[PDB]
Amino acid sequence: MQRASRLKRELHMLATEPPPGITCWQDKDQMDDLRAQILGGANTPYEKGVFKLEVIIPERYPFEPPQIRFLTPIYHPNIDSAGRICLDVLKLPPKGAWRPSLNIATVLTSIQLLMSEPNPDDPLMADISSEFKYNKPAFLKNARQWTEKHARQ
Amino acid sequence: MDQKILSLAAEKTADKLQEFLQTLREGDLTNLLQNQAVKGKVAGALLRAIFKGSPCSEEAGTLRRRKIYTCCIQLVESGDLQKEIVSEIIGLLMLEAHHFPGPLLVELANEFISAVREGSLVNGKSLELLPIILTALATKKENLLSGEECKKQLINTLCS
């Protein structure tokens, strides 16, 4: 029930006032789950990329966080080859940081924040978290080539 | 004066780097403190060239390796440097504490003992090397006292 009352403000609020570089609409394939587009963070290798995410709303939402993956392939320390996201506000307390004081927008903002600022202390990809840190340009080259084959048009 | 170590670490290992370590010889105190004060990313591809040039199979790499670390432990403590380069430098001391022989790491741990007694430990990021060296001491089960015996006396001296 609560899913409807959150999603109502959220769908409406993501059509009327979504965050900068970000959109979220009720999916045309999937008229239950949400499609987002996060446009590649400025002065990151993701520049000129449009990154599609599926946001799965759980049933007991807003008591559980949203369930988000990068559907556009992304070369990133906190994102693996299947789009899985290392995010605190994607999990519940104490491992995570979701709570009802948040919403789909605040997390999708925190997603464009993580695209620009990969965290090397939560590596899903040790090769990319190491490359990001120790050969920044090779990470930025590979992620920008990534952005040209997969996040381009 | 960094870009004549980046054209050495690109070609081969221990044929032109090992000759640069013995020809410079002047000091690795002014070649790090000032080369980070200009560009911190020039104090992290210099150490990824010096450590590649100075492997622990020879003696004029190990006393270079034992000199670069004592100054690199002193500057992360002494200096009030940026927190993105202390994460970079301590992220090279951790990635290179794996393949040490015995009597150098007990002396580095004695420097650590000296730091814990008196010296102004403004950041506990310098003590991040104290875990991995107590691991790397324990895995060498050979008389350098075996690894575990040196570890127990080391923990006794830390604690007391």
CATH number of domain containing A31: 3.10.110.10
- d(CA B32, CA B14) in angstroms, rounded, equals 21
Q: What is the dihedral of CA A7, A12, A15, A16, to 10 degrees?
A: -140
Let me know: does B118 contact B90? Beta carbons within 8 Å.
Answer: no
- Which of A129, A132, A134 to probe the B interface (max B CBs under 10 A)? A134
Tokens describing residue B29 = 């105190």
- Segments forming the whole domain that contains residue A92: 2-153
- Closest-CA distance, A151 to chain B, in angstroms, reads 29
Q: Answer yes or no: do A136 and B48 touch at CB < 8 A.
A: no
- d(CA A30, CA B156) in angstroms, rounded, equals 64
Widest CA span in chain A: 49
Contacts of A134 in chain B (CB under 8 A): 44, 48
- Closest-CA distance, B105 to chain A, in angstroms, reads 25
- d(CA A136, CA B22) in angstroms, rounded, equals 30
Name the residue of chain B whose CA is nearest to A136's CA.
B41
Phi–psi pair at A68, nearest 5 degrees: -120, 140
| The one-letter amino acid at A117 | E
Return the bridge partners of A56, or none. Answer: A67
Number of domains in chain A: 1
A137 and chain B: CB distance < 8 Å anywhere? no
Tell me which method was used to determine the 3D structure: cryo-EM
Let me know: does A76 contact A118? Beta carbons within 8 Å.
Answer: yes
| Residue B134: C-alpha distances to residues A17, B97, B137, B155 (Å) | 55, 10, 5, 9
B96 and chain A: CB distance < 8 Å anywhere? no
Name the residue of chain A whose CA is nearest to B44's CA.
A134
Catalytic entry in A14, A24, A39, A86: A86
Taking alpha carbons only, the member of B149, B123, B120, B122 closest to residue B134 is B149
- Angle, to 10 degrees, between the axis of helix A136-149 and the axis of helix A126-134? 120
| The one-letter amino acid at A136 | K
Tokens describing residue A4 = 């409807």
B52 and chain A: CB distance < 8 Å anywhere? no
**A24 included as an active-site residue:** no
